PDB file of C-alpha atoms (C1' of nucleotides) in Angstrom:
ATOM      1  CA  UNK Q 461      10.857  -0.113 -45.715  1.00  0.00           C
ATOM      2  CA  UNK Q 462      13.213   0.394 -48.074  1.00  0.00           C
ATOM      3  CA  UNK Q 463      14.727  -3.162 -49.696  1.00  0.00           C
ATOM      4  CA  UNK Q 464      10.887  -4.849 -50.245  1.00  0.00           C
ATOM      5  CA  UNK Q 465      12.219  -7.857 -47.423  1.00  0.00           C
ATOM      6  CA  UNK Q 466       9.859  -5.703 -44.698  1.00  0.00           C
ATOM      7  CA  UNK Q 467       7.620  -5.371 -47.988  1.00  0.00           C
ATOM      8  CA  UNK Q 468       4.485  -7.434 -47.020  1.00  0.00           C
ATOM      9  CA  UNK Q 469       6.271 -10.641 -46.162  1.00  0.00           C
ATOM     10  CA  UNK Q 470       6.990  -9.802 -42.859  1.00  0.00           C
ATOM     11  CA  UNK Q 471       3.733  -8.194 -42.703  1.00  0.00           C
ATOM     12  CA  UNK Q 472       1.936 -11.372 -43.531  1.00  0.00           C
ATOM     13  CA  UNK Q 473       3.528 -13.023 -41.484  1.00  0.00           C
ATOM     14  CA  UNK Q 474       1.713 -11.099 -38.593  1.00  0.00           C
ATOM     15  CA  UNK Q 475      -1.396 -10.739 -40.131  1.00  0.00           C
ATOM     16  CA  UNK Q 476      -4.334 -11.782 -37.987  1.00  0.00           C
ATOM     17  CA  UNK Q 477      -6.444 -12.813 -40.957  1.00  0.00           C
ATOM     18  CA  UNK Q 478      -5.157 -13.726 -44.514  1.00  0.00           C
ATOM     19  CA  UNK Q 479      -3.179 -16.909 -43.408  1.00  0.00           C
ATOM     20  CA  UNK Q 480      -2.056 -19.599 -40.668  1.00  0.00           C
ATOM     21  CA  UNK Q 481       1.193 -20.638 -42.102  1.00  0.00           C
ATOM     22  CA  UNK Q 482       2.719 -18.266 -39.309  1.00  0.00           C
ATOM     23  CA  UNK Q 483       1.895 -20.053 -36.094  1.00  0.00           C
ATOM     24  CA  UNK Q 484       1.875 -16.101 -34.295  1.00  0.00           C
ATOM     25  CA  UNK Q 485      -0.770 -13.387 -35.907  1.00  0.00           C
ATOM     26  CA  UNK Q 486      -0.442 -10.203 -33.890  1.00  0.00           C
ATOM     27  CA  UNK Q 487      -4.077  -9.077 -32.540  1.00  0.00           C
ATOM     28  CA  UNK Q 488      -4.168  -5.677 -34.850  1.00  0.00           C
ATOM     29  CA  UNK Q 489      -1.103  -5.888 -37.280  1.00  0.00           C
ATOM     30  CA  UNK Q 490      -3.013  -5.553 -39.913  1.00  0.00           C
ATOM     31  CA  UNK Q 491      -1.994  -5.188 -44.242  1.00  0.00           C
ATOM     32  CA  UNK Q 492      -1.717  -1.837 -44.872  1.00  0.00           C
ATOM     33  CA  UNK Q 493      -4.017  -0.573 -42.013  1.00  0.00           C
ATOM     34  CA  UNK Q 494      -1.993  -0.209 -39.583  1.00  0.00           C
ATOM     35  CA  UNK Q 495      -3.520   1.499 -36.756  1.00  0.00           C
ATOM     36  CA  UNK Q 496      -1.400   0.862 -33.346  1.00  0.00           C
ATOM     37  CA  UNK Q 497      -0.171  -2.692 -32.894  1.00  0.00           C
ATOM     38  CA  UNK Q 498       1.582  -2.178 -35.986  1.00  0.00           C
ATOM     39  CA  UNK Q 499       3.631   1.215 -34.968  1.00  0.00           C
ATOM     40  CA  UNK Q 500       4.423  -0.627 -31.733  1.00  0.00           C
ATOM     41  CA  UNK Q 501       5.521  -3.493 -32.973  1.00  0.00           C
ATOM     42  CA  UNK Q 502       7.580  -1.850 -35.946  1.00  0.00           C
ATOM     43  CA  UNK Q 503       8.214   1.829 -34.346  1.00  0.00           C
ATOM     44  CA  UNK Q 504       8.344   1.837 -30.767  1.00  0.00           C
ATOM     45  CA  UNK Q 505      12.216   1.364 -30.208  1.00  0.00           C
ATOM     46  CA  UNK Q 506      11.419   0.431 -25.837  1.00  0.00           C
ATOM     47  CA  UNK Q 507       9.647  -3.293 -26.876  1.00  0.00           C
ATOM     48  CA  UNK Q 508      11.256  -6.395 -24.271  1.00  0.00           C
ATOM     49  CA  UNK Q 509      12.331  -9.633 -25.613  1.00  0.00           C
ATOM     50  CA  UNK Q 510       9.607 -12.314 -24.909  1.00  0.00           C
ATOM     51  CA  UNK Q 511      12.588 -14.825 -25.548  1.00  0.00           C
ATOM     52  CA  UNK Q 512      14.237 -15.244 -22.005  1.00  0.00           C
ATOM     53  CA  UNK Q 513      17.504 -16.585 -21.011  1.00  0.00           C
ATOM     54  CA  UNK Q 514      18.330 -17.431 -17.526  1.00  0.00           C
ATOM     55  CA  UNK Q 515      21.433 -19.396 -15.894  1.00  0.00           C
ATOM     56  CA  UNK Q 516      20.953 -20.517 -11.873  1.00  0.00           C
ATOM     57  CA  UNK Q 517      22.951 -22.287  -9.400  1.00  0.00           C
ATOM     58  CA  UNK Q 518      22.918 -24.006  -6.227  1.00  0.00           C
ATOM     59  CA  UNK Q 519      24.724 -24.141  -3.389  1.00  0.00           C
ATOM     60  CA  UNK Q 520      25.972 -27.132  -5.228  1.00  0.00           C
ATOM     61  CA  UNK Q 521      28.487 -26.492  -8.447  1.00  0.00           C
ATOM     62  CA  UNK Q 522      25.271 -27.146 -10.698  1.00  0.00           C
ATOM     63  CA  UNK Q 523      23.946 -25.070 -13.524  1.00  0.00           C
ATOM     64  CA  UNK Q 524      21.076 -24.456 -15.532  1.00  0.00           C
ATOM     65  CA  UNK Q 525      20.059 -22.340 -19.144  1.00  0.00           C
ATOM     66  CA  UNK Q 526      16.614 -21.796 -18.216  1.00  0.00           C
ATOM     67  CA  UNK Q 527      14.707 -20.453 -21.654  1.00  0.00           C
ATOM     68  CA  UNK Q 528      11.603 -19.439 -21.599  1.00  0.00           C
ATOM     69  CA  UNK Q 529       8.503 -17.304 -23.728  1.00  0.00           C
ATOM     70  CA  UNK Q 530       6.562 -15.122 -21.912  1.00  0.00           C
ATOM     71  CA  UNK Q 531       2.821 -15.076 -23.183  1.00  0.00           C
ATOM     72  CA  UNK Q 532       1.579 -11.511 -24.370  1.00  0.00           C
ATOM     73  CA  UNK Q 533      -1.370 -10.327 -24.933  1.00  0.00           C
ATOM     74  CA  UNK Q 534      -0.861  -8.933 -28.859  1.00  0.00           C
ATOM     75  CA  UNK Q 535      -0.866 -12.503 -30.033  1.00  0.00           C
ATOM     76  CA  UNK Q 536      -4.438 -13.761 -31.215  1.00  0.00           C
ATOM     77  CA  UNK Q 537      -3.946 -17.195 -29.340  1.00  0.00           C
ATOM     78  CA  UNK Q 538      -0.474 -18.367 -30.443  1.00  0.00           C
ATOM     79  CA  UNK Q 539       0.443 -21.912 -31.396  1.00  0.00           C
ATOM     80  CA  UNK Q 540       1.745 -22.763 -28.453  1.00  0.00           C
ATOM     81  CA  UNK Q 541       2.837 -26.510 -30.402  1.00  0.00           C
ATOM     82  CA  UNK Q 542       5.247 -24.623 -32.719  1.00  0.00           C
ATOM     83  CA  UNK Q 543       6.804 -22.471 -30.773  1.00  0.00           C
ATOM     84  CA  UNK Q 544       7.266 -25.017 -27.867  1.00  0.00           C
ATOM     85  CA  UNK Q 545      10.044 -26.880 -29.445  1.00  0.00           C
ATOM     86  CA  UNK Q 546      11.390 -23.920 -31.091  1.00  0.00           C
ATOM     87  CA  UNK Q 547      12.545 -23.136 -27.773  1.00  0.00           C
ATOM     88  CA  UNK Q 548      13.698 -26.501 -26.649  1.00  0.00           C
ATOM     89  CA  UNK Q 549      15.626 -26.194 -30.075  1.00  0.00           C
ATOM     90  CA  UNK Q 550      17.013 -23.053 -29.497  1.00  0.00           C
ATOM     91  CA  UNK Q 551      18.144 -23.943 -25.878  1.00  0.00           C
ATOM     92  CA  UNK Q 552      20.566 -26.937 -27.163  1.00  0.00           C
ATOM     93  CA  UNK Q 553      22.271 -25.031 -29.693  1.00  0.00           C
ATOM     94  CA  UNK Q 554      23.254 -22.415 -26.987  1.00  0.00           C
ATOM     95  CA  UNK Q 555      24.618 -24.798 -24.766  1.00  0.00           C
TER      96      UNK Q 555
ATOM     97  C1'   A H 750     -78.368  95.247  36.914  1.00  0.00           C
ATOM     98  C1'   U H 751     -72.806  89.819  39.685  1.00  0.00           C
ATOM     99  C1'   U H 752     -68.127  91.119  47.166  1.00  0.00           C
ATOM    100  C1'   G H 753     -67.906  94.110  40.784  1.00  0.00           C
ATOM    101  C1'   A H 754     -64.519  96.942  36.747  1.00  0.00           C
ATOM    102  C1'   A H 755     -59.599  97.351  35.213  1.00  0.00           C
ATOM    103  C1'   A H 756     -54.161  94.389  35.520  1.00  0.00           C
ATOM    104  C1'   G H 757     -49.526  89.927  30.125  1.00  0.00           C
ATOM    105  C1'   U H 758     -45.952  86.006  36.078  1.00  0.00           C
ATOM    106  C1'   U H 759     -43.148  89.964  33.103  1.00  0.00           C
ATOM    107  C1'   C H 760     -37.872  91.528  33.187  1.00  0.00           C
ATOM    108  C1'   A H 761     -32.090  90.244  33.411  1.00  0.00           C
ATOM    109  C1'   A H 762     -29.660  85.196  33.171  1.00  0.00           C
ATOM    110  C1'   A H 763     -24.522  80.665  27.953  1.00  0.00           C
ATOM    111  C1'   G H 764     -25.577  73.715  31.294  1.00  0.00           C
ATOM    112  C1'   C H 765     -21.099  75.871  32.092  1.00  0.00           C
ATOM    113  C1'   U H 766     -16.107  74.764  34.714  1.00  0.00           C
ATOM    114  C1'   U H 767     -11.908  70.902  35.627  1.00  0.00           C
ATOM    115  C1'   A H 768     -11.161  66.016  33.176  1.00  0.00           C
ATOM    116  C1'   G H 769      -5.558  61.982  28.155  1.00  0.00           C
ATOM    117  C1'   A H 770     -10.111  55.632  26.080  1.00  0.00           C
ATOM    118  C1'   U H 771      -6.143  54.909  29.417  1.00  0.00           C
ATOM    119  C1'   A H 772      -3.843  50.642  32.296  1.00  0.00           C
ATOM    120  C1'   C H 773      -2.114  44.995  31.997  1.00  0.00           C
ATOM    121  C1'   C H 774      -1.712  41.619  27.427  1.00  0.00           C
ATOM    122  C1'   C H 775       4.565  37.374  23.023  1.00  0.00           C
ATOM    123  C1'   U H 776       0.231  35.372  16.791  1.00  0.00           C
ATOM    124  C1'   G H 777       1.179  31.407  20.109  1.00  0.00           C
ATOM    125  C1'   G H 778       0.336  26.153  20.667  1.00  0.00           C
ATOM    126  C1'   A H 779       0.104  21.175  17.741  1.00  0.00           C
ATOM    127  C1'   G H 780       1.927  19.298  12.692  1.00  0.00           C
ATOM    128  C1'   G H 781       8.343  14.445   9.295  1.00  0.00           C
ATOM    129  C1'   G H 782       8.768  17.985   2.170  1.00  0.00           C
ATOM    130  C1'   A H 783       7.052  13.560   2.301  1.00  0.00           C
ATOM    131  C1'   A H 784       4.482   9.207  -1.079  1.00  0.00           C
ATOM    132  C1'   A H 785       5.193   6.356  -5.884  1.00  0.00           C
ATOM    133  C1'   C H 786       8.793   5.132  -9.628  1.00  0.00           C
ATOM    134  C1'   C H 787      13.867  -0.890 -13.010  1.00  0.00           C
ATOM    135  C1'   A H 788      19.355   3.450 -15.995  1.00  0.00           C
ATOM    136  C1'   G H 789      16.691   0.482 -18.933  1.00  0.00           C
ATOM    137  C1'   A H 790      15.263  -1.694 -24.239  1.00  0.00           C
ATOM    138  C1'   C H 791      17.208  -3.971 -28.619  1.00  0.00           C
ATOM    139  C1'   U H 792      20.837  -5.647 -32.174  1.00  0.00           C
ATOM    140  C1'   U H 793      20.809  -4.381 -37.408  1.00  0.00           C
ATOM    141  C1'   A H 794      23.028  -3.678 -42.205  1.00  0.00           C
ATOM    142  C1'   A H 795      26.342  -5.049 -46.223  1.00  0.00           C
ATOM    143  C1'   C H 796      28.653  -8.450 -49.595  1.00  0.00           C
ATOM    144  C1'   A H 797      30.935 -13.329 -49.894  1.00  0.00           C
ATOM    145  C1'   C H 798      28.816 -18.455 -49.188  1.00  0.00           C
TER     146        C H 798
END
RNA sequence: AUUGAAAGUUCAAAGCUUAGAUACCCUGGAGGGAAACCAGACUUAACAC
């Protein structure tokens, strides 16, 4: 908190009330009341990456960039529409 | 008014002497310092555009 860009912005945009413009609210991230969700999402420096990258082969010379999202269980039921294609997005630019 | 009357079973006297709770006898037998556990998590900031 220190250059106003953490300043409620990203805050709202993990608010579980207040809007749906964000397609991912965080179950207790709440404005200003932050109780737990909000330390551990913002404080608690031992989080993994629900973004996952992983390349396979076969016994054949054939490759793959899997990407996928693991569901969690802070997220007061994602849009799982929006985020879909974000992946397949991000996927093609990395490859 | 009697086969009666009278008469202390009394005196002296150490349950003492000798004598080892000793002899033989393994705190031993059986029993796993093991069981569980990711050396891992993540990039951010600055200005230029």
């Amino acid at each position: 908190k220190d250059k106003g860009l953490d300043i409620g912005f990203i805050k709202n945009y993990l608010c579980e009330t207040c809007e749906t413009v964000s397609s991912f609210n965080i179950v207790d991230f709440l404005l200003s009341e932050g109780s737990f969700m909000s330390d551990y999402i913002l404080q608690y420096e031992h989080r993994n990456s629900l973004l996952r990258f992983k390349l396979i082969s076969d016994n054949s010379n054939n490759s793959y960039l899997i990407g996928y999202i693991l569901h969690s269980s802070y997220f007061k039921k994602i849009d799982i529409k929006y985020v879909r294609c974000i992946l397949e997005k991000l996927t093609y630019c990395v490859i």
